[PDB]
Design an enzyme around this catalytic site. Structure first.
Site, mmCIF file in Angstrom:
data_model
loop_
_atom_site.group_PDB
_atom_site.id
_atom_site.type_symbol
_atom_site.label_atom_id
_atom_site.label_comp_id
_atom_site.label_asym_id
_atom_site.label_seq_id
_atom_site.Cartn_x
_atom_site.Cartn_y
_atom_site.Cartn_z
ATOM 1 C CG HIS A 291 66.816 -7.288 -40.377
ATOM 2 N ND1 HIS A 291 67.074 -8.385 -39.581
ATOM 3 C CD2 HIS A 291 67.988 -6.661 -40.543
ATOM 4 C CE1 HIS A 291 68.362 -8.412 -39.275
ATOM 5 N NE2 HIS A 291 68.939 -7.380 -39.857
ATOM 6 C CG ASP B 216 71.534 -5.766 -38.376
ATOM 7 O OD1 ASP B 216 70.978 -6.751 -37.860
ATOM 8 O OD2 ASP B 216 71.447 -5.478 -39.592
ATOM 9 C CB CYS C 110 61.243 -10.837 -33.295
ATOM 10 S SG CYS C 110 60.420 -11.924 -34.498
ATOM 11 C CG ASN D 154 68.704 -13.204 -35.087
ATOM 12 O OD1 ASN D 154 68.343 -13.104 -36.264
ATOM 13 N ND2 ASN D 154 67.829 -13.430 -34.116
HETATM 14 C C1 LIG Z 1 58.006 -14.753 -41.480
HETATM 15 O O1 LIG Z 1 58.099 -14.820 -40.050
HETATM 16 C C2 LIG Z 1 59.356 -14.616 -39.531
HETATM 17 C C3 LIG Z 1 60.360 -15.564 -39.772
HETATM 18 N N1 LIG Z 1 61.631 -15.368 -39.249
HETATM 19 C C4 LIG Z 1 61.867 -14.202 -38.480
HETATM 20 C C5 LIG Z 1 60.864 -13.254 -38.235
HETATM 21 C C6 LIG Z 1 59.576 -13.467 -38.731
HETATM 22 C C7 LIG Z 1 58.612 -12.545 -38.544
HETATM 23 C C8 LIG Z 1 57.291 -12.776 -38.457
HETATM 24 C C9 LIG Z 1 56.560 -11.653 -38.345
HETATM 25 C C10 LIG Z 1 57.306 -10.541 -38.318
HETATM 26 C C11 LIG Z 1 56.807 -9.321 -38.247
HETATM 27 O O2 LIG Z 1 57.103 -8.571 -39.184
HETATM 28 N N2 LIG Z 1 55.931 -8.973 -37.267
HETATM 29 C C12 LIG Z 1 55.580 -9.792 -36.088
HETATM 30 C C13 LIG Z 1 55.987 -9.101 -34.775
HETATM 31 C C14 LIG Z 1 55.747 -7.582 -34.793
HETATM 32 C C15 LIG Z 1 56.654 -6.925 -33.722
HETATM 33 O O3 LIG Z 1 57.886 -7.037 -33.788
HETATM 34 N N3 LIG Z 1 56.061 -6.197 -32.762
HETATM 35 C C16 LIG Z 1 56.964 -5.496 -31.810
HETATM 36 C C17 LIG Z 1 56.611 -4.006 -31.798
HETATM 37 C C18 LIG Z 1 55.128 -3.850 -31.406
HETATM 38 O O4 LIG Z 1 54.873 -4.484 -30.149
HETATM 39 C C19 LIG Z 1 54.789 -2.385 -31.237
HETATM 40 N N4 LIG Z 1 53.441 -2.245 -30.666
HETATM 41 C C20 LIG Z 1 53.209 -2.487 -29.307
HETATM 42 N N5 LIG Z 1 51.904 -2.349 -28.797
HETATM 43 C C21 LIG Z 1 50.919 -1.977 -29.632
HETATM 44 C C22 LIG Z 1 51.188 -1.758 -30.926
HETATM 45 C C23 LIG Z 1 50.062 -1.424 -31.523
HETATM 46 C C24 LIG Z 1 49.098 -1.425 -30.615
HETATM 47 N N6 LIG Z 1 49.620 -1.761 -29.446
HETATM 48 C C25 LIG Z 1 48.758 -1.842 -28.251
HETATM 49 C C26 LIG Z 1 52.418 -1.884 -31.435
HETATM 50 O O5 LIG Z 1 52.627 -1.669 -32.623
HETATM 51 C C27 LIG Z 1 54.275 -4.473 -32.502
HETATM 52 C C28 LIG Z 1 54.591 -5.984 -32.612
HETATM 53 C C29 LIG Z 1 56.099 -6.944 -36.163
HETATM 54 C C30 LIG Z 1 55.884 -5.560 -36.230
HETATM 55 C C31 LIG Z 1 56.978 -4.732 -36.461
HETATM 56 C C32 LIG Z 1 56.785 -3.369 -36.516
HETATM 57 C C33 LIG Z 1 55.506 -2.833 -36.356
HETATM 58 C C34 LIG Z 1 54.413 -3.647 -36.131
HETATM 59 C C35 LIG Z 1 54.605 -5.019 -36.073
HETATM 60 C C36 LIG Z 1 55.349 -7.630 -37.207
HETATM 61 S S1 LIG Z 1 58.878 -10.873 -38.482
#
Ligand SMILES: COc1cnccc1-c1ccc(C(=O)N2CC[C@@H](C(=O)N3CCC(O)(Cn4cnc5c(ccn5C)c4=O)CC3)[C@H](c3ccccc3)C2)s1
Length: 332
Positions: A251, A268, A13, A8
């Site tokens: 995670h 994982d 992510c 990782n």
């Molecule tokens: C402290 O900072 C760190 C330090 N070290 C390591 C890691 C970090 C992190 C920082 C932030 C982290 C995090 O928690 N984030 C950011 C990325 C984000 C992520 O992984 N995403 C992929 C899946 C995703 O594209 C799914 N998706 C696609 N298209 C969409 C939607 C909604 C509308 N549309 C048009 C949608 O939900 C959402 C974004 C995370 C997430 C996960 C699940 C649900 C929503 C959002 C939230 S982790």
């Protein structure tokens, strides 16, 4: 398991999760290997770097690294992953590959595998005017907030919207119009990437807020009733291949059953364990840990998609180069 993890390497992510989903798309893997990266720049080349990760996943007994791949598509500076949805990372990779396979014997594999067709229509309620546009799609974004399950999201997806006061359709020569807009599905592809819309806009905290709500999805998924024309010869019945998961607000994890046989593993990072169907599916409905993306395969197509891959499915040319490349890496 017999399956190797990924290291990782950054805050990449979802990338590890995505890579694994892609790797076990065997028909894709074997196409990838056939790409002519003979004279491709070792570091600048995205298509090479993907071949490298795949190679390693198929051969390494030890966790596999991603650095050269990350660098290749220039997603390093923190925020590179947060700023993008998982489907955009997909698009970047597949597009590169799609293009590398142009003018080869494996030209066309990507659309073949992932592209479905769709129609957006606007129908004026009072006048005869109708706009029809067919669209290509490689992935589908589903609404979940205030939907119980996949069916309810799909329902919503093809739902008719009314264009009334303020939102009145500009029907050109026929001025503004009460009119209705909808989308409907012409085809579904062999491999179905669904993303669940769990992030949404914050008019308050102004960040992407995660909806941990329960959302339900089946092991088997019928979709013929969402087509225009159905087909007896090959119905649109889908088999759950992969559940990309995230917990917290993060995670990242992915459950697969690589042969589509209900023999699930949890992937994982470096650690791959066999797991129960329950752990893979229902345990990730949510309500926190829960799915954000699903992968279904069309039952009829499983056996071509998940066609077996041998070590002789890598060109020996390619093998040679990677072996040398790995060797020359000798730290004092
Ligand atoms: C402290 O900072 C760190 C330090 N070290 C390591 C890691 C970090 C992190 C920082 C932030 C982290 C995090 O928690 N984030 C950011 C990325 C984000 C992520 O992984 N995403 C992929 C899946 C995703 O594209 C799914 N998706 C696609 N298209 C969409 C939607 C909604 C509308 N549309 C048009 C949608 O939900 C959402 C974004 C995370 C997430 C996960 C699940 C649900 C929503 C959002 C939230 S982790």
């Amino acid at each position: 398991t017999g399956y190797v993890g990924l290291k990782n390497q950054g805050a990449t992510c979802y990338m590890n999760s995505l890579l694994q989903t892609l790797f076990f798309t065997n028909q894709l893997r074997k196409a990838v290997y056939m790409m002519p990266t003979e004279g491709d720049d070792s570091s600048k080349s995205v298509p090479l770097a993907l071949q490298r990760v795949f190679y390693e996943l198929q051969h390494s007994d030890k966790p596999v690294g991603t650095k050269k791949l990350t660098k290749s598509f220039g997603w390093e500076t923190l925020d590179s992953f947060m700023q993008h949805d998982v489907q955009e990372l997909c698009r970047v990779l597949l597009d590169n590959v799609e293009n590398k396979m142009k003018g080869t014997c494996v030209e066309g594999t990507i659309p073949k595998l992932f592209r479905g067709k769709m129609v957006s229509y606007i129908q004026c309620k009072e006048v005869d005017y109708r706009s029809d546009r067919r669209e290509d799609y490689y992935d589908i974004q589903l609404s979940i907030k205030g939907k119980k399950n996949i069916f309810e999201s799909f329902v919503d997806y093809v739902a008719v919207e009314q264009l009334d006061g303020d939102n009145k359709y500009d029907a050109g020569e026929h001025g503004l119009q009460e009119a209705e807009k909808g989308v409907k599905f012409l085809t579904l592809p062999p491999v179905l990437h669904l993303q669940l819309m769990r992030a949404m806009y914050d008019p308050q905290t102004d960040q992407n807020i995660k909806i941990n709500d329960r959302f339900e999805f089946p092991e088997q998924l019928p979709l013929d009733e969402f087509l225009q024309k159905t087909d007896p010869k090959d119905p649109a019945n889908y088999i759950l291949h992969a559940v990309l998961v995230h917990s917290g607000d993060g995670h990242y994890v992915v459950y697969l059953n690589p042969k589509g046989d209900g023999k699930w593993c949890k992937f994982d990072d470096d650690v791959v364990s066999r797991c129960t169907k329950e752990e893979a599916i229902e345990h990730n409905y949510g309500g926190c840990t829960n799915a954000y993306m699903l992968v279904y395969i069309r039952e009829s197509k499983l056996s071509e998609v998940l066609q077996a891959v041998t070590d002789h499915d890598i060109p020996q040319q390619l093998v040679e180069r990677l072996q040398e490349e790995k060797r020359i890496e000798a730290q004092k």
